[PDB]
Ligand binder design. Structure first.
Ligand code: HEM
Ligand SMILES: [O-]
Length: 153
């Protein structure tokens, strides 16, 4: 797990995201979709976004970005005691949305990239280490639920 010091770093970094949840959410999803087009296909409502300009101009994409980061933020604030919050998310993503765990790795990487992109020089090595541990814990706990369901893709 993460140490108290690491969780404090995670939540300090998260404060940066909370100042502009929509902007961060939008950029994380655009980073995901442009770097891994196959992920866009999992969203029937975003499949029409044929270009990054259309992605940038989509208010519904920003809306979903807000939903995604709000959910992740809720989980992070639990500092690992997130079973009740994480289980339903893991189950909807495996059973309803059919999201392979690889795509969760992709979005975790996108979050780290967006943090550096929006806060260059202000997302330190310690902060990156802590946030990475938090995202890995998140991903790994979802993976355990995916294994329970026998879900691969
Ligand atoms: C940080 C990771 C993620 C978080 C916190 C997150 C959170 C959410 C939430 C809260 C919802 C709405 C409630 C629900 O259906 O469970 C949702 C819906 C959805 N998610 Fe995610 N998600 C994550 C990653 C992904 C990834 C990586 C994909 C696909 C590559 C994905 C695909 C979907 C789809 C298709 C929906 C339904 C969208 C719609 O048509 O309204 N999610 N997600
Ligand atoms: O999502």
């Amino acid at each position: 797990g993460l140490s108290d010091g690491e969780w404090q770093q995670v939540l300090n970094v998260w404060g940066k995201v909370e100042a502009d949840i929509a902007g961060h959410g939008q950029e994380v999803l655009i980073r995901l979709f442009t770097g891994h087009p196959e992920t866009l296909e999992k969203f029937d409502k975003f499949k029409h976004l044929k270009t990054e300009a259309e992605m940038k101009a989509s208010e519904d994409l920003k809306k979903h970005g807000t939903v995604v980061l709000t959910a992740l933020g809720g989980i992070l604030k639990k500092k690992g005691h997130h079973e009740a919050e994480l289980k339903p998310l893991a189950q909807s993503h495996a059973t309803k949305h059919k999201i392979p765990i690889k795509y969760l790795e992709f979005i975790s990487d996108a979050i780290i990239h967006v943090l550096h992109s929006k806060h260059p020089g202000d997302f330190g090595a310690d902060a990156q280490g802590a946030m990475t541990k938090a995202l890995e814990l998140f991903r790994n706990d979802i993976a355990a639920k995916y294994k329970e369901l026998g879900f691969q893709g």
